[PDB]
Amino acid sequence: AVHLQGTELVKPGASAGVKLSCKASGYTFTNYDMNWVRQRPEQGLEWIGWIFPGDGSTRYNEKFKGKATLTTDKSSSTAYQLNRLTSEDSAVYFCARRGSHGSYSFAYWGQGTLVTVSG
Amino acid sequence: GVGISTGTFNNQTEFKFLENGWVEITANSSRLVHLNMPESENYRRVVVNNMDKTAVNGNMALDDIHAQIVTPWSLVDANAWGVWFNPGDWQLIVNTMSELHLVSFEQEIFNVVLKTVSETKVYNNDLTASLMVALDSNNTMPFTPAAMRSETLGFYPWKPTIPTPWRYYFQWDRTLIPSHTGTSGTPTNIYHGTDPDDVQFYTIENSVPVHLLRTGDEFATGTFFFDCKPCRLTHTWQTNRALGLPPFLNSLPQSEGATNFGDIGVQQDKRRGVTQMGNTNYITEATIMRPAEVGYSAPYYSFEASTQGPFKTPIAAGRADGNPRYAFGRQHGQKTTTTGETPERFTYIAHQDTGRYPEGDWIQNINFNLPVTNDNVLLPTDPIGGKTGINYTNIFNTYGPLTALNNVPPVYPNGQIWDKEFDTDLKPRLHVNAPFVCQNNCPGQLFVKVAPNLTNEYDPDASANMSRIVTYSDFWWKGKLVFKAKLRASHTWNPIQQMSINVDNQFNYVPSNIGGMKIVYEKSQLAPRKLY
Amino acid sequence: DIVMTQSHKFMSTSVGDRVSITCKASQDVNTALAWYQQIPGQSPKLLIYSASNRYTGVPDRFTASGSGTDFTFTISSVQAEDLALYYCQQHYTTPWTFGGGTKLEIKR
Numbered sequence: 001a002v003h004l005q006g007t008e009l010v011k012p013g014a015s016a017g018v019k020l021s022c023k024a025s026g027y028t029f030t031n032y033d034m035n036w037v038r039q040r041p042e043q044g045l046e047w048i049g050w051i052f053p054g055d056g057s058t059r060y061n062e063k064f065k066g067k068a069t070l071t072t073d074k075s076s077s078t079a080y081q082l083n084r085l086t087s088e089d090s091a092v093y094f095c096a097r098r099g100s101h102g103s104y105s106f107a108y109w110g111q112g113t114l115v116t117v118s119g
Numbered sequence: 120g121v122g123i124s125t126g127t128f129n130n131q132t133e134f135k136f137l138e139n140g141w142v143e144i145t146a147n148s149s150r151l152v153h154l155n156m157p158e159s160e161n162y163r164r165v166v167v168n169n170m171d172k173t174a175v176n177g178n179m180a181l182d183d184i185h186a187q188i189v190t191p192w193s194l195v196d197a198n199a200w201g202v203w204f205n206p207g208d209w210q211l212i213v214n215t216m217s218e219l220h221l222v223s224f225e226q227e228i229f230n231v232v233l234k235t236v237s238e239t240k241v242y243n244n245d246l247t248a249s250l251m252v253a254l255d256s257n258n259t260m261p262f263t264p265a266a267m268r269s270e271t272l273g274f275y276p277w278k279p280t281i282p283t284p285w286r287y288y289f290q291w292d293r294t295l296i297p298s299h300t301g302t303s304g305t306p307t308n309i310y311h312g313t314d315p316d317d318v319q320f321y322t323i324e325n326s327v328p329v330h331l332l333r334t335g336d337e338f339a340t341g342t343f344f345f346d347c348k349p350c351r352l353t354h355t356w357q358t359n360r361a362l363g364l365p366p367f368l369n370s371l372p373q374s375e376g377a378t379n380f381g382d383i384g385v386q387q388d389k390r391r392g393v394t395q396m397g398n399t400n401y402i403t404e405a406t407i408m409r410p411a412e413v414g415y416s417a418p419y420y421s422f423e424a425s426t427q428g429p430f431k432t433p434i435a436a437g438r439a440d441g442n443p444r445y446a447f448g449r450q451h452g453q454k455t456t457t458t459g460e461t462p463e464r465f466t467y468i469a470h471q472d473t474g475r476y477p478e479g480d481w482i483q484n485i486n487f488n489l490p491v492t493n494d495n496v497l498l499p500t501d502p503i504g505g506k507t508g509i510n511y512t513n514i515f516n517t518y519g520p521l522t523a524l525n526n527v528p529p530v531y532p533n534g535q536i537w538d539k540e541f542d543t544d545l546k547p548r549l550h551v552n553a554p555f556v557c558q559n560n561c562p563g564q565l566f567v568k569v570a571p572n573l574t575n576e577y578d579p580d581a582s583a584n585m586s587r588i589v590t591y592s593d594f595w596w597k598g599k600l601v602f603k604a605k606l607r608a609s610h611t612w613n614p615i616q617q618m619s620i621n622v623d624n625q626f627n628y629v630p631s632n633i634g635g636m637k638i639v640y641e642k643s644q645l646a647p648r649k650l651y
Numbered sequence: 652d653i654v655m656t657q658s659h660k661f662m663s664t665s666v667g668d669r670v671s672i673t674c675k676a677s678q679d680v681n682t683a684l685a686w687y688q689q690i691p692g693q694s695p696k697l698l699i700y701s702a703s704n705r706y707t708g709v710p711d712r713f714t715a716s717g718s719g720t721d722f723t724f725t726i727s728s729v730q731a732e733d734l735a736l737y738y739c740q741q742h743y744t745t746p747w748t749f750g751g752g753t754k755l756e757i758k759r
Binding site: 029031033052054064098100101102103104 | 169170171172174175176298300301303305
Binding site: 005034044045046047061062063065099101103104105107108109110111112 | 670684685687693694695696697700704706738740742745746747748749751752
């Protein structure tokens with residue numbers, strides 16, 4: 001009964017940041033890292049990073065280093081992404097979790113939160 | 120009494136120059152130790168299992184599973200070089216001395232002051248409260264050096280220090296079958312529990328006498344007398360290629376310069392000497408017979424598993440692998456004005472040339488057809504097991520009866536001084552964490568606790584924890600460590616390497632404008648030494 | 652960074668046939684490969700992990716094979732609920748990289 005629930009649409013201007021959230025239910029939150037992926041309609045899927053809520057340990061890729069910061073909140077079982085500058089980074093963002101196996105496959109995904117940057 | 124001091128502050132290092140080139144070094148260390156009341160006055164049995172990281176395939180090395188008894192007592196550790204020496208005394212020792220003995224050790228606790236917080240906050244004096252001190256002289260409780268967790272007393276005589284909460288390892292079982300990114304199964308990640316034949320629950324109350332020190336009392340552990348081997352402050356440079364009589368040069372250079380070399384004017388298959396290759400006539404520097412072997416090769420980044428999980432096989436001497444990495448905080452050398460929880464780290468590269476260079480080894484067939492082909496050689500660039508990143512040097516052990524190696528050097532200021540010997544039948548030849556090793560008995564550990572300060576509503580038949588008055592102590596610790604050193608003599612025409620201050624390392628030894636201090640790491644074995 | 656290229660972007664398919672999507676990797680990943688299926692407008696669903704193993708709940712018509720730099724993901728009998736966008740992820744090293752996708756069609 002693992003369920004990930006992300007927040008809904010956001011429409012920021014092309015100067016600021018938006019904090020996306022992902023609420024986890026159905027498992028020991030601190031037993032699994034939380035991964036964030038991006039889907040643009042042309043450049044495909046892309047992996048942003050992961051956050052281990054216990055010990056709060058992050059890892060990004062070189063592309064989203066200064067662009068997104070991950071944060072965890074225990075006692076609420078929530079994950080957060082910051083999306084610092086957000087120039088034309090409009091895409092659908094997913095909050096994913098590994099699975100029961102041990103490979104970094106993604107068994108459980110959130111419904112996706114769309115982020116559109118316009119004026 | 121209530122208004123009489125019970126001891127004196129002394130943080131001086133005295134050098135007494137006996138005759139015949141022997142020096143006594145008396146290091147006095149005085150600190151002000153601040154102690155809080157325990158979070159709980161009960162013993163806890165806690166299991167740590169980081170399933171989140173080790174369930175991922177490939178993270179076997181990130182295993183942190185264990186079981187520990189958490190104790191309401193605190194430990195007072197002074198087994199680190201920085202507690203006893205500042206950069207100046209360390210310079211004097213490592214520039215003037217050659218060996219180092221460990222003679223004596225003693226501790227005292229004095230000027231105990233116990234206080235109570237009342238909530239603004241008011242701080243009152245508990246003239247009738249007591250501080251429990253225990254000294255494990257018989258060495259019954261498990262040994263626990265703090266220098267490996269960087270939890271000793273601080274390195275500054277003018278900075279108050281805290282003791283570390285005591286705890287020890289409880290037995291457990293753990294199986295972690297390794298894997299990699301791309302494994303098709305779920306091998307096994309199981310914490311089994313405890314084998315009833317290995318349970319060991321120690322308590323300070325049942326093993327050691329406890330003294331209750333009030334404001335006008337003091338504790339004095341008598342002087343412990345070591346009996347160990349001398350630590351050498353000289354390093355060796357001779358490998359197996361520099362042992363014995365060199366080859367006679369029949370053509371010496373005529374024009375002194377940079378690229379003018381000498382020549383052994385004898386063919387390699389017409390030279391005289393002894394070899395251990397009884398089927399070849401070549402006598403070279405890589406083939407000639409040396410007395411023994413200096414150093415050894417060992418499987419590097421190798422993990423052996425046992426009943427409690429996987430662990431890294433320790434390497435005696437390194438040249439990467441073998442070099443210890445030290446991480447520490449603001450009390451132990453880091454800039455006291457930095458912000459953040461990132462510790463300061465350094466890798467100690469020792470001066471001694473007793474390691475190996477695996478990118479330069481190789482094996483070849485016993486036929487020894489010197490221009491070697493592919494099928495008759497094993498290089499550090501061939502796959503072992505089909506793995507592109509694993510060559511034979513990763514699974515190679517050349518430790519034999521002909522192996523000679525040196526003990527580990529002192530690491531200022533974060534290294535340990537002394538260690539306890541393993542209580543086994545066959546003992547190891549050296550430790551990798553301390554130059555000195557107590558073989559039979561080692562100084563006892565000093566545990567401190569603040570006595571329970573009960574209120575008027577106390578019920579032992581209540582499941583909740585006892586309600587205590589918030590109490591904290593500050594006492595003064597004093598220590599005397601006596602070494603014996605030999606003053607070094609010059610046997611060469613040329614100077615040697617010495618430790619000194621210069622324009623690059625200048626501000627590492629003086630404080631900043633806001634009171635920021637730091638103790639950088641210094642090398643110990645500076646001067647060379649003849650091996651053969 | 653490991654780039655993973657799926658051969659075609661659109662693969663023709665008639666219901667009941669056997670379809671084989673192909674995936675290539677820039678460098679050698681031993682098995683280290685996962686296959687996802689995404690209906691347009693929803694979250695992806697994990698179909699295969701370790702390039703051969705089938706996740707719990709996936710119908711037995713999806714299979715996969717391969718190793719090194721070549722991988723294949725085949726449906727032995729197509730249904731109308733199988734025409735989606737199939738993605739090829741590598742979990743050999745970070746950063747995790749996905750493929751471009753191959754949309755399965757019905758023949759015109």
